[PDB]
């Protein structure tokens, strides 16, 4: 049946003649079909959130009804594309319209049906077999790097009646046929899935593997794990976007979904200009990371409502690629944008506001979003195991941490990376506040180090106490000048200064520091802690001597060694073997031991 | 008892988030239970909240999704929510709504009881007196707990309150039934907490004597309103029809208050403080007044909720109103956890009603309470000296200030510092306190009575 528009106010639309309507149903509004969703019903009137711009819509326009909620489509060719807030193949749209702009009511299929793919049947599938859904039954070489694997969705079962042979096949072509209770249902390479649902899993598993990031401070102090949840609140302008981009470029994962909500398109164009050139190596084959990434951007100026659809679509795609049987992670950008969109929608609906104008159920929705991450055992008789990591970015107003958004966010996430604007103002680009950040995954990783980096475990511990003592002494420095402290205090201050200047500072744009391998980091930390140990031993041994050594004597005696310590980080990973770097660090350590022996 | 054929309607006249409005219902009953059928085969349940003329307001515990106007059906029961109750509920885990979540069957109905419970005469309550050994020097001593008391825990985000819960579970006992039956319920928590609790209980062999309710963050929030009462009804049945002593744990009441806020905002009632409904005070009074002994019977309930803290404001509405109902409160401090103290507990904000419980005549010993008070005063003065030192240099310090500081570091590093599984006898804790006291010369211990000073100081 049909509906007729009764009233309009911004991105909301009141309608009539909706007696048979159901809520969270899709609807198409106006002469130019605009996607929508139901939120509220009274009598036969209804309320509709419109994901497109609202303009030119008059009273009485047709309102077509569909019997499905919001949903997306899954299959080959998704990798490497770009999508609007709803599933829409942006590149195909620009080619189709042959125009710069995006028409308001444009309609394009999610994935082109005219692209063949080389499907191979699974070798174990015989006629008459049963798979009970959620099971791989094929494979596809959609691109050179990743092998896309077709799987029947759950809630489906039956006996096999036909399997296509290997060969080339376009989309929307029947491949598998099953017959469960005398009724034969066909299937194509493309499935569908409701957005607001959650794909079930065989089981969940505990976090047990580290997620190397390449950044020194994060990997040395507050590491994340695969399957983990992270949050990075920051003042307005701290390079959070850069942290997200660096993480995407140098993760350990296999497929990365970058969802930029409420952002400037210039970053997207920069990413498109950069990713194709940057490459990486799998099994001796070098190819661009753009193939193992997918993009979904919703520029700020776009309609406000589409932000929530963007956020949900990201997690749905990542969950599909989790069932796919890989490790993946996503860059969720500026959830506060989704919060603001929800605030506007609720305010237009005249609900009872909660703290700071945001509606009450913001926290509940954030929880429903965040729990969908973790390591899992998947459906499908061939045994599969994957994981999904969330990396949210938050931008509280005024740079304060009192607004309800961050307060709700911190109540769920397990690891927290606060960013301090003062560091950013003094060009300390990885602006991490070590004093307030905390990671709850300090456990469940000691064994990984036991089998790889056993020596590393106490080093970071010692680093933490030296920084803490520096903080406790800093105010006494501020209110009371120097020359009132023992030599141990002064040398600890110096060691903290060296730690800040070198171990913490990382410039992601330089060739020599665009990415830090772990061995480089642990070598640096070992060198610094060895220096601190030797210096403290030297001063305490001579504490009771008539020729007690002072900081000035040490500094003059081995200042060149201090320059070497500062300059050790100017080594590339490429064009420089790991053995060479380790040899240089050992040689520097030996020089330091010689300098301490000479005293 | 019996009833008549139930009524059914297809008159859904409204839908507003978690609420549904109906019309033309004959003789509605307040707080009745209903069953909803969606256009598909799914089935749900709800509860009535308002009635006027022929209008019925209901709330759906399973969230609202797929509801329409012309196809949805509703059914009307006879009475209020009455839940099954059995002694076999031990060893059985459920979800928030009480439906079995493990692979086992529906609970056999030994007896039906009212979820809301029943008021108890103040005459019939018996004052709790049996002090409890917790094996934690921080808890015992300054904040010992009698059986029947209702102390909460205060915890900011990212602090190890869960480990405190596990530690108090494993260390439950009495000063010398040999254990307690644990009725533990969780409100909107991540999978890690549930795994931790289940694994810890399984390792200690306590599945035989624990009943769990699990409400996770991904489940609809509306059932959080019912879940705590579903725990407490079972608790009080075990405490007043089996004479079994019970330690009932709740956690993260902030989510319960949030659910109340959802309902109130949906109902457009006059907000009070920070969007919380005004009568939520009475609501919390209702949910906390289910402990204490009673004559003619044996057994009791010891109520220990955990409270997640918005930011760190002690003066936030939730902690304030919980402070007016619970006799005491234990405080978890962020600074101590920053300084790597496994039980990060600040004694200063903490307080309990032990003045009549732990005395010594049959309890630990005579000098107990005096020792505790003296330690508390000494710690307060030590913190004052610490504040003084942050202003001026070390030169202005006298002998007293150095003594106080030194006492502060020793007490922080030895008394409070205590690894997990490290059960400590109460007498050992008092001996440690005496060792700390011996540092100061005997003259400055003003609170101590003279006889005790002569007896125990040397």
């Amino acid at each position: 049946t049909f509906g007729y528009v009764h009233g309009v106010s911004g991105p909301v639309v009141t309608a009539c003649d909706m007696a048979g309507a159901a809520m969270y149903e899709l609807v198409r509004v106006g002469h130019s079909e605009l996607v929508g969703e139901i939120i509220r019903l009274e009598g036969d009137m209804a309320t509709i959130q419109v994901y497109e711009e609202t303009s030119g819509v008059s009273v009485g326009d047709p309102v077509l009804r569909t019997g499905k909620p919001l949903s997306v489509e899954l299959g080959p060719g998704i990798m490497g594309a770009i999508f609007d807030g709803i599933q829409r193949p942006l590149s195909d749209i620009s080619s189709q319209t042959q125009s710069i702009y995006i028409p308001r009511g444009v309609n394009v299929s999610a994935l082109s049906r005219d692209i063949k793919w080389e499907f191979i049947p699974s070798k174990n599938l015989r006629v008459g077999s049963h798979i009970t859904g959620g099971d791989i039954y094929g494979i596809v070489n959609e691109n050179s790097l990743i092998k896309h694997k077709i799987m029947l969705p759950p809630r489906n079962r039956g006996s096999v009646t036909y399997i296509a042979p290997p060969g080339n096949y376009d989309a929307s072509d029947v491949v598998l046929e099953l017959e469960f209770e005398g009724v034969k249902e066909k299937f194509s390479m493309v499935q569908v899935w409701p957005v607001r649902q959650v794909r079930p899993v065989t089981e969940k598993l505990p976090a047990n593997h580290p997620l190397l990031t390449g950044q020194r401070v994060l990997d040395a102090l507050f590491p994340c794990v695969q399957g983990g949840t992270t949050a990075i609140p920051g003042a307005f302008g701290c390079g959070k976007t850069v942290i997200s981009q660096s993480l995407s470029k140098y993760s350990n994962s296999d497929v990365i979904i970058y969802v930029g909500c409420g952002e400037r398109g210039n970053e997207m164009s920069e990413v498109l200009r950069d990713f194709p050139e940057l490459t990486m190596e799998v099994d001796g084959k070098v190819e661009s990371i753009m193939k193992r990434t997918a993009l979904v951007a919703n520029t700020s100026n776009m309609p406000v409502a589409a932000r929530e659809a963007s956020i949900y679509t990201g997690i749905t795609l990542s969950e599909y690629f989790r069932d796919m049987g890989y490790h993946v992670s996503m860059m969720a950008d500026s959830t506060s944008r989704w919060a603001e969109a929800l605030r506007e929608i609720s305010g237009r609906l005249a609900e009872m506001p909660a703290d700071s104008g945001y509606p009450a159920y913001l926290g509940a929705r954030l929880a429903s979003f965040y729990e969908r991450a973790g390591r899992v055992k998947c459906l499908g008789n061939p045994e599969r195991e994957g994981s999904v990591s969330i990396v949210g970015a938050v931008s509280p107003p005024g740079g304060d941490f009192s607004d309800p958004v961050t307060s709700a966010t911190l109540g769920i996430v397990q690891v927290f990376w606060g960013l301090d604007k003062k560091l950013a103002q003094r060009k300390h680009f990885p602006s991490v506040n070590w004093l307030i950040s905390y990671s709850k995954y300090m456990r469940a990783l000691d064994e990984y180090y036991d089998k790889h980096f056993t020596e590393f475990v106490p080093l970071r511990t010692k680093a933490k106490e030296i920084l803490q003592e520096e903080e406790d002494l800093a105010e006494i420095v501020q209110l009371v000048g120097k020359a009132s402290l023992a030599e141990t205090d002064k040398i600890t201050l110096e060691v903290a200064k060296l730690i800040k200047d070198d171990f913490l500072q990382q410039n992601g744009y330089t060739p020599y520091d665009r990415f830090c391998p772990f061995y480089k980091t642990v070598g640096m930390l070992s060198n610094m802690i060895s220096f601190y140990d030797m210096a403290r031993r030297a001063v305490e041994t001579t504490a009771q001597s008539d020729n007690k050594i002072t900081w000035s004597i040490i500094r003059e005696h081995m200042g060149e060694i201090l320059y070497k310590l500062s300059s050790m980080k100017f080594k590339d990973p490429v064009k420089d073997g790991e053995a060479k770097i380790k040899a240089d660090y050992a040689q520097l350590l030996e020089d330091m031991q010689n300098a301490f022996r000479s005293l | 008892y019996l009833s008549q054929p139930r009524l059914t309607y297809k008159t859904v006249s409204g839908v507003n988030g978690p609420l549904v409005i109906l019309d033309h219902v004959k003789f509605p009953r307040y707080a009745e239970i209903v069953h909803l059928t969606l256009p598909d085969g799914t089935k749900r349940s709800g509860q009535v909240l308002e009635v006027s003329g022929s209008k019925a307001v209901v709330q759906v515990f399973e969230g609202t999704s797929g509801i329409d106007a012309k196809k949805t059906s509703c059914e009307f029961t006879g009475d209020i929510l009455r839940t099954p109750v059995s002694e076999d509920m031990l060893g059985r885990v459920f979800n928030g709504s009480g439906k079995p979540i493990d692979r086992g069957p529906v609970v056999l109905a030994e007896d039906f009881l009212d979820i809301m419970g029943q008021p108890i005469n103040p005459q019939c309550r018996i004052y709790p007196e049996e002090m409890i050994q917790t094996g934690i020097s921080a808890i015992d001593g300054m904040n010992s707990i009698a059986r029947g008391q209702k102390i909460p825990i205060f915890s900011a985000a990212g602090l190890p309150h869960n480990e405190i819960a596990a530690q108090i579970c494993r260390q439950a006992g009495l000063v010398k039934e040999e254990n307690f039956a644990i009725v533990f319920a969780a409100m909107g928590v991540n999978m890690e907490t549930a795994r931790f609790f289940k694994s810890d209980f399984e390792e200690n062999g306590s599945m035989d004597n624990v009943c769990l309710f699990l409400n996770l963050a991904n489940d609809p929030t509306i059932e959080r309103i019912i879940t705590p009462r579903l725990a407490l009804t079972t608790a009080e049945f075990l405490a007043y029809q089996c004479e079994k002593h019970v330690l009932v744990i709740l956690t993260d009441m902030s989510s319960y208050a949030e659910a109340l806020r959802e309902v109130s905002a949906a109902r457009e009632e006059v907000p009070g403080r920070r969007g919380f409904p005004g009568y939520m005070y009475t609501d919390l009074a209702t949910i906390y007044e289910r402990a204490g002994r009673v004559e003619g019977r044996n057994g009791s309930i010891t109520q220990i909720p955990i409270l997640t803290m918005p930011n760190d404001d002690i003066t936030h509405p939730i902690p304030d109103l919980t402070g007016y109902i619970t006799e005491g409160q234990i405080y978890v401090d962020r600074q101590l956890h920053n300084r790597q103290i496994y039980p990060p507990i600040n004694v200063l904000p903490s307080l309990s009603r032990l003045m009549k419980s732990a005395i010594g005549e049959g309890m630990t010993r005579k000098d107990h309470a005096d020792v505790s008070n003296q330690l508390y005063a000494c710690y307060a003065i030590g913190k004052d000296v610490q504040a003084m030192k942050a202003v001026v240099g070390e030169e202005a310090l006298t002998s007293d200030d150095l003594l106080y500081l030194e006492f502060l570091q020793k007490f922080e590093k030895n008394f409070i510092t205590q690894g997990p599984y490290e059960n400590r006898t109460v007498y050992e804790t008092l001996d440690i306190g005496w060792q700390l006291l011996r540092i100061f010369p005997k003259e400055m211990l003003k609170r101590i009575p003279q006889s005790t000073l002569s007896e125990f100081y040397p």
Binding site: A350, M352, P353, G357 | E268, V270, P271, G275
Partner: peptide, 13 residues
């Protein structure tokens, strides 16, 4: 103040 304005607005019906 905004909460009170809203409740009065709704009460006007």
């Amino acid at each position: 103040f905004y909460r009170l304005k809203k409740i009065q607005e709704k009460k006007k019906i």
